[PDB]
């Protein structure tokens, strides 16, 4: 996403009121673009046995593109919600 900042300062409005904006208030300045920062990872819990990126019942760190196109559409893994943290640790305790 594109994060902008205003070049000119907006005068404060009241505590209930909305500020008044002018031409100089929509002169902008890009500060960051979240499109291209280094890629993060999301935590998936893998619920089948797949190649050594993960094994059944294990919480793993997976590259975002691979986790979103393969593991979740095919149901191979599930999101690391606290609910299924508890559910799969209960399953492991049963095992």
């Amino acid at each position: 996403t594109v994060i902008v900042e205003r070049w000119w300062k907006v005068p404060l409005a009241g505590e209930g009121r909305k500020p008044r904006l002018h031409r100089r208030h929509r002169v902008y300045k890009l500060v960051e673009d979240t499109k291209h920062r280094p890629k993060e990872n999301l935590e998936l819990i893998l619920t089948q046995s797949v190649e050594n990126v993960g094994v059944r019942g294990d919480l793993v760190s997976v590259k975002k593109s691979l986790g979103r196109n393969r593991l979740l559409p095919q149901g191979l893994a599930v999101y690391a919600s606290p609910e299924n943290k508890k559910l799969f640790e209960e399953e492991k305790l049963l095992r």
Partner: protein
């Protein structure tokens, strides 16, 4: 002369006097609520006060939002509160230079999503912000049920919301029978966002649809006065037979 009421208040006067008055209460509550979105294209001040530089005094800070622009394709899809930034920019990051128009657009994808409550694969025009909000919401079903009306910011997204909410509120035979335990698992997974059907039918509508739905409710093809007056006469004759 002068109007009795200000012109910014004319719309509320309509919403109080019309068929818009016969709209149900919760719907008009939402329409009047109309809160503020989540920061997407601007970075919020984490604090209400800040010791500004150049003099060590705390000035109050408010964070003012960028006027973002959403096209009808956005409403056909789902953009996560993300839209076009139509603004100006200075030529070389230097105010003593040309000032010149600029339109910042998002990046758009055609992704295919499964919703466990409706059991259907939708292909929609998402962006990375929706994908990330879905990941932090732990699924599309949770994202659409949890996200607010204007943070979701899609006519389609709120159609999905009231379809899902009506599905929950009626507890429908959603996939088919022979899996009622799996259906119970689904509705138990999303049992927290359960609202009455008389509310879930009005979730997410525009005002035009709400007025159309309301007048469809109150059409009521007229009662013949033959029926009305024979009812009155039968009542009067039974009263006379009693007396």
């Amino acid at each position: 002369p002068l109007h009795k009421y200000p012109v910014w208040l004319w719309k509320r006067l309509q919403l109080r006097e019309g068929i818009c008055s016969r709209l149900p209460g919760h719907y008009l509550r939402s329409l009047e609520e109309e809160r503020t979105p989540t920061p997407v294209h601007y970075r919020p001040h984490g604090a209400k006060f800040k010791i500004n530089p150049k003099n060590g005094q705390r000035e109050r800070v408010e964070d003012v939002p960028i006027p973002i622009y959403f096209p009808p394709e956005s409403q056909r899809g789902l953009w996560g509160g993300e839209g076009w930034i139509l603004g100006q920019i200075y030529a070389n990051n230097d105010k003593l230079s040309k000032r010149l128009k600029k339109v910042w657009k998002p990046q758009l994808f055609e992704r295919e999503f499964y919703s466990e409550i409706l059991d259907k694969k939708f292909t929609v025009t998402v962006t990375m912000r929706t994908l990330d909000l879905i990941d932090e919401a732990y699924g599309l079903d949770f994202y659409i049920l949890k996200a607010s009306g204007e943070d979701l910011c899609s006519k389609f997204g709120m159609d999905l919301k009231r379809g899902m909410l009506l599905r929950l509120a009626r507890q429908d035979p959603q996939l088919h029978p022979e899996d009622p335990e799996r259906r119970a698992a689904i509705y138990d997974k999303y049992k927290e966002f359960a609202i009455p059907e008389e509310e879930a039918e009005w979730v997410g509508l525009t005002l035009e649809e709400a007025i159309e739905k309301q007048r469809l409710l109150e059409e009521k093809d007229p009662v013949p006065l033959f029926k009305i007056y024979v009812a009155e006469l039968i009542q009067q004759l039974q009263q006379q037979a009693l007396s």
